Structures are given as structure tokens and as C-alpha cells.
Amino acid sequence: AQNPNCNIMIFHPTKEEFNDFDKYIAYMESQGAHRAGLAKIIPPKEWKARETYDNISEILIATPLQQVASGRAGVFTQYHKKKKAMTVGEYRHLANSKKYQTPPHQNFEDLERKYWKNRIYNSPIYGADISGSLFDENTKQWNLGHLGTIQDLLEKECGVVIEGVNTPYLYFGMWKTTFAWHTEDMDLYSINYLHLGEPKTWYVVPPEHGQRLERLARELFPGSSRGCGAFLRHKVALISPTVLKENGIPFNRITQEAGEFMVTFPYGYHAGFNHGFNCAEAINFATPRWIDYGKMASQCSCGEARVTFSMDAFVRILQPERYDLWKRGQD
Numbered sequence: 001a002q003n004p005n006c007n008i009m010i011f012h013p014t015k016e017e018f019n020d021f022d023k024y025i026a027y028m029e030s031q032g033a034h035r036a037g038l039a040k041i042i043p044p045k046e047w048k049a050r051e052t053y054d055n056i057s058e059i060l061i062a063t064p065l066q067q068v069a070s071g072r073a074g075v076f077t078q079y080h081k082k083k084k085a086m087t088v089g090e091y092r093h094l095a096n097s098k099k100y101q102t103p104p105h106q107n108f109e110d111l112e113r114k115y116w117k118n119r120i121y122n123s124p125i126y127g128a129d130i131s132g133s134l135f136d137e138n139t140k141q142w143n144l145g146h147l148g149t150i151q152d153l154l155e156k157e158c159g160v161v162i163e164g165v166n167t168p169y170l171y172f173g174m175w176k177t178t179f180a181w182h183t184e185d186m187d188l189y190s191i192n193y194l195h196l197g198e199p200k201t202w203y204v205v206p207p208e209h210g211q212r213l214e215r216l217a218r219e220l221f222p223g224s225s226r227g228c229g230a231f232l233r234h235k236v237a238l239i240s241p242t243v244l245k246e247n248g249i250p251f252n253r254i255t256q257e258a259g260e261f262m263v264t265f266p267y268g269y270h271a272g273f274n275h276g277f278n279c280a281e282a283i284n285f286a287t288p289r290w291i292d293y294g295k296m297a298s299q300c301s302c303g304e305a306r307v308t309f310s311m312d313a314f315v316r317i318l319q320p321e322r323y324d325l326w327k328r329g330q331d
């Protein structure tokens, strides 16, 4: 078995190897990369996502989210308070203000210590989940707006044509902006490209050990657990590395820098935080290996998780028994 300790693997494809996206994912999996739940891909030196970032300031962040925490430093939830619209140039200036900017620090480890010590005492503002792309249309390789769609993958594997579309999302971050512990919708893959700015630190639980994280979460968030049998689908709970180590949960960590891709694998729980002003682009995708994960994915039916139009068909075809109850949650 390749990668039996479930370490995060880092790949350096050549420009020739960067042509065929599906083939390269399958290669990484041949080497055991999926066992970690997360992999890093450093693009060939010849590749670029676009020519410059000099003209992005007029993108609108229609609904910036202030991420307000409750709990203790290592075990907390966050809720998202909607703020007034602002442009990316206005958000960048905010991120760089004395109230929100990254503190002085020695290295990524010192910054990580400061994040876990102090996150709960601040409410950073995240421009998350913005439909759009920063890849140039002429970028042919690993262009997250030109991937094969999940609907087409389901159709190729299972023969059933379904409605729905699959487009990317932009994320504008600042110091302390936080992504809570989650797997993807329908336990899909994700791919995330850090276009510019400061790093993003990731934490990940191997897919084979995901249920250990779920059991800990039920213990740490006991009211939430009674409310919903899949409350991590709400994307609000944070647990620190120190707490995970105290409770014996297997996990790994890595920091993504500008110009790098990350792939999350089916049922790979992940969480993390931004170091400072940045912009990322991410999208879900599928492979043949995902289908069995999609069939088994948990679902929130309490009403909180509320997701996209396109998840309907995935539930309806892969999980027909759950469909009725899940759809009640959506309506």
C-alpha cells in the first residue's frame, strides 16, 4: 500500500505532465496521495495562471462575512455576520489596516501559534464564496474554469444525464480568516489555487480516519450534535491541533503559498486559516473513484447546511432513499 502513514505529498509535475489533469490526479493516487486527504501541486516553472493581478481591484465582494467566534481558544464555533458590500481594493486596504493586519512574527510556526492563541478574540472579514475566475481564458493547463464537470463525470460513469452546473469560486482572505472543519459537498474532491498574497495553512484528517474526527466533534459540540446528525456540514466548528493531538486524532498540516495548488480528496476533513491578504480560487470535481464516496456521503437534513442547486441531482441519483428527507431540509 502506497503512503501507509497518510502523509501529505507534494508533487512537481513537468509541463508535459501538466497537460492532462485527470491523468495526473490518477497518478497522484497511484502514489498514495489520497490517503492523506490533501496534496500540494507545484506547477511547472513555465506555467502561469494569468499575466498579472494588477487589475482586480474592481471585483465586488457583495456580502463580506465577519467571522465571529464563540467558545475557547482551541474549541470554538464561528458565525458569519453579513457586512456591506465592498470592492477587492477596499477589502485589501481593510486587511492591511492596523486593526486587521498580520502581526509581526518570526516564521510560519510562530504565526500558527499566534493564530491558535488569539483567533477567538478577533472577528476577521472573509470575502468568500464569490462565483468567478481569475484564470486567463488562454491558460490551457489546470484552468479551474475549464475542468470536466461533475455532471459529465456522473453521466460517463453511471449513464444518467442530469441537470446542474459546476463553476469556480473566489475567496479573498485576511489575517485570521478561517475555514471550519468540513468535507466537500457529497464528499467530492476540491482543488484550490492560491492566486496571490499571503499563505493559507491547512489541517487535514486522512479519509480512513474521518469518523474519529466526527466522534470527537460530537463530544466537543454536544448541543450541535443533538441538533443534527451531520452538523460538520454546517461549516462552523473549529478544533485546534493541540486538541486533536490530546485526543489522539490523526491529522497533518501544511502551508500553501501563492502560486501553488492544493487538492482535497473525497472524505478528507480539512480546516485552516489565512496569514494575511490573499485571493484563492477553488472548485469541486469528481473522478471515477469518487462515486462510491458520493453514495455514502452524510447529509444535513436539519436545514442549516443549505447548498447549491446542483447537489439535488447528486442526492437524487446516488442516494434515492435519503432524497425525500434531504430535500425537506432544503425547502
Ligand SMILES: O=C(O)CNC(=O)C(=O)O
Residues within 6 Å of the ligand: 171, 178, 179, 190, 191, 192, 264, 270, 280, 282, 283
Ligand atoms: O480556502 C478556503 O477558505 C476554503 N477552501 C476549501 O475548503 C477548499 O478549497 O476545499
Ligand SMILES: [Mg+2]
Residues within 6 Å of the ligand: 055, 056, 057, 058, 059
Ligand atoms: Mg477589477
Ligand code: NI
Residues within 6 Å of the ligand: 182, 183, 184, 190, 264, 270
Ligand atoms: Ni473545502
Ligand SMILES: [Zn+2]
Residues within 6 Å of the ligand: 227, 228, 229, 230, 231, 233, 234, 300, 301, 302, 303, 304, 305
Ligand atoms: Zn444540519
